[PDB]
Amino acid sequence: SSQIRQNYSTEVEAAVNRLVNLYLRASYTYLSLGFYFDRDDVALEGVCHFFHELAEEKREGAERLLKMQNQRGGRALFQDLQKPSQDEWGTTLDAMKAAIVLEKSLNQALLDLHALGSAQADPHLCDFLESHFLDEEVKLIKKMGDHLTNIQRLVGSQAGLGEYLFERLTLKH
Amino acid sequence: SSQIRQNYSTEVEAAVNRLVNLYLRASYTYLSLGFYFDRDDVALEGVCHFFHELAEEKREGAERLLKMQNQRGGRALFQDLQKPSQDEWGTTLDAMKAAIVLEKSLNQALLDLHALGSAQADPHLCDFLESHFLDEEVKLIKKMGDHLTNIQRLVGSQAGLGEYLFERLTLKH
Amino acid sequence: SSQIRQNYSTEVEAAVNRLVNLYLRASYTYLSLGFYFDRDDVALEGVCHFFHELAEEKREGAERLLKMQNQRGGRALFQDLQKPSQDEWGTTLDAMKAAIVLEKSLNQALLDLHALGSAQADPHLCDFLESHFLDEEVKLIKKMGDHLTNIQRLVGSQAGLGEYLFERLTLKH
Amino acid sequence: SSQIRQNYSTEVEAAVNRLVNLYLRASYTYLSLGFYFDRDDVALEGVCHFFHELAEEKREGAERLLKMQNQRGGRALFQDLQKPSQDEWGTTLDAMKAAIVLEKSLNQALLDLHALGSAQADPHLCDFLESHFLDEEVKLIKKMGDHLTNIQRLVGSQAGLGEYLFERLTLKH
Ligand SMILES: [Cl-]
Ligand SMILES: [Cl-]
Ligand SMILES: [Cl-]
Ligand SMILES: [Cl-]
Ligand SMILES: [Ir+4]
Ligand SMILES: [Ir+4]
Ligand SMILES: [Ir+4]
Ligand SMILES: [Ir+4]
């Protein structure tokens, strides 16, 4: 058992394990989003790349949380990863709306865990979230909001044309 | 005559000669497609480049088959190359639909010859098709499907605009 | 829907989706194994690295399968990922025994899918597994067998000493 | 006197001076540990290096605290440095146990001062500890826990052999 654990509450340890599950589920959702945009009948490579990069970013967030759990002397506990909420993700607009819903839920989970750390007087936990998660999340939600606005400007009455141009002229290929 | 031929059926030898003719005919079809898109009254350079590169790829497939026919001790026999099925190829969409029809027919000819090789217990033939043709063909049909989807998204009610943008922003110039 | 699908059975499409789930579950199992060996009360960094690298390899196998599913015009369908079978993995020997059990099950799933592809006369599927999975799996099982033998030689009556030496002198740090 | 001091409580100023004394005492303890492992009748160079590097790290922590005390307009006050608690440090295991006791006491002193800064609404102090001390301390305690586990695995019934191997194969020389 641990000879290192100090100032690390069972409540934080459990919440950190829950947050790992949320990040892994987010990674899985993005894996599904990316491959949907790779379908021959969807074929938006920039959209595929955007979600594939987010699947890797969320897996890395989960790994940083697991590394921290061991650094503090907590014990990683894994649960089932629920499959993503959809099998098909509709338009780039539908997908970007689903992504910002998902990120808002992750952000609230970070803010909840920060509040628990503050209540528990766990400044290492609070610093860890501030340093590696809170600003990364604000920057990503701002980028998704910027994308949603541009996608929405492009619908007009020529939705196909706008979806193509957004993928060609904003997203990376 | 051959002092090398071993495990190489007359049925495979004949089918390989037929497949050479199919690949050369495909190369000819792509030659015609490329020059149609170079016409001053069509003038889509990315479309011209796309089909010109496929004419070279199909000629190279035919040459690899002929090289293999000699490696096995079979005898190349050439037939007339039928002119392509059209003199004018319509829109980029019409052309890409004709290209995927053509590739599906080539792919079926590869799968038929693989099945004959398997029936004849000719693993060298089966490996040769797996190594140099079957995945090349799946990748090319996937690319053409991706293109068809993007071309179709771009028609809307402004067909000229979509045809220009597809050629400028997806195809190479 | 797909305009590319050719010679790709619904049975193979479903089995490919099952195999993706098996590879993702294997990746998750290895994620749990790696973090267990990073615990302050286990602290075997070479063992941690060995399983962490396998988590990445299994995720990459799943992604290659998903890429192929789209290349063939099949549709990715994701299921829940079952949590790994243990929360604590015992000794390096226990862990390596669990890993070879897991790899044998993956290998049998590859051989089953190859047999289905052969029955369905799907040479692209058969080639894909031969080219990217079957030899990778044989090489990995051979490496794990080599490790198991060395770990077993090192138990003697000084189990702690042998576990340390194996991690220091065979595994990478 | 100071023309810069702003939001810097006398309680924090005094506690910062106490923490400087704790860090300097820790540096002194590590100086004694390092030279003990350099004795001709102990002769564990990796253990000597490990503690000598920690003596320098703790002196640097004290200097950063003194720099910050002046940055805030507080006044450094030095007290006697108590000699270390032992003249001889026993085995590498005894020494590593004494080191983690010492680090746990330093960590608690950091957490206490963070709590005082939070009570005093002194965010600069709180940020300073989060940025330069709290994670450095968690990482060091995790490393010492990892070492303790490896040292403990190596005792078995051949304590001399395990002590040699730990110093040769884990610690730097
Ligand atoms: Cl479900
Ligand atoms: Cl004739
Ligand atoms: Cl369960
Ligand atoms: Cl005095
Ligand atoms: Ir992609
Ligand atoms: Ir041209
Ligand atoms: Ir690790
Ligand atoms: Ir020394």
Curated annotation (Swiss-Prot), chains A, B, C, D:
Subcellular location field: Cytoplasmic vesicle, Autophagosome; Cytoplasm; Autolysosome
Pfam families: Ferritin
Keywords, in A-Z order: Acetylation, Cytoplasm, Cytoplasmic vesicle, Iron, Iron storage, Lysosome, Metal-binding
InterPro entries: Ferritin (IPR001519), Ferritin-like (IPR012347), Ferritin-like_diiron (IPR009040), Ferritin-like_SF (IPR009078), Ferritin_CS (IPR014034), Ferritin_DPS_dom (IPR008331)
Coiled-coil portions: none
Binding site for Fe cation: 53, 56-57, 60, 63
Gene Ontology process terms (BP): intracellular iron ion homeostasis; iron ion transport
Highest taxon above the source species: Eukaryota
A molecular function GO annotation: ferric iron binding
Ranges for domain Ferritin-like diiron: 6-155
Modification N-acetylserine, positions: 1
Signal sequence range: none
Subunit details: Oligomer of 24 subunits. There are two types of subunits: L (light) chain and H (heavy) chain. The major chain can be light or heavy, depending on the species and tissue type. The functional molecule forms a roughly spherical shell with a diameter of 12 nm and contains a central cavity into which the insoluble mineral iron core is deposited. Interacts with NCOA4.
PANTHER family, per the entry: FERRITIN, FERRITIN LIGHT CHAIN
Function according to Swiss-Prot or TrEMBL: Stores iron in a soluble, non-toxic, readily available form. Important for iron homeostasis. Iron is taken up in the ferrous form and deposited as ferric hydroxides after oxidation. Also plays a role in delivery of iron to cells. Mediates iron uptake in capsule cells of the developing kidney. Delivery to lysosomes by the cargo receptor NCOA4 for autophagic degradation and release or iron.
Full protein name: Ferritin light chain
Gene: FTL
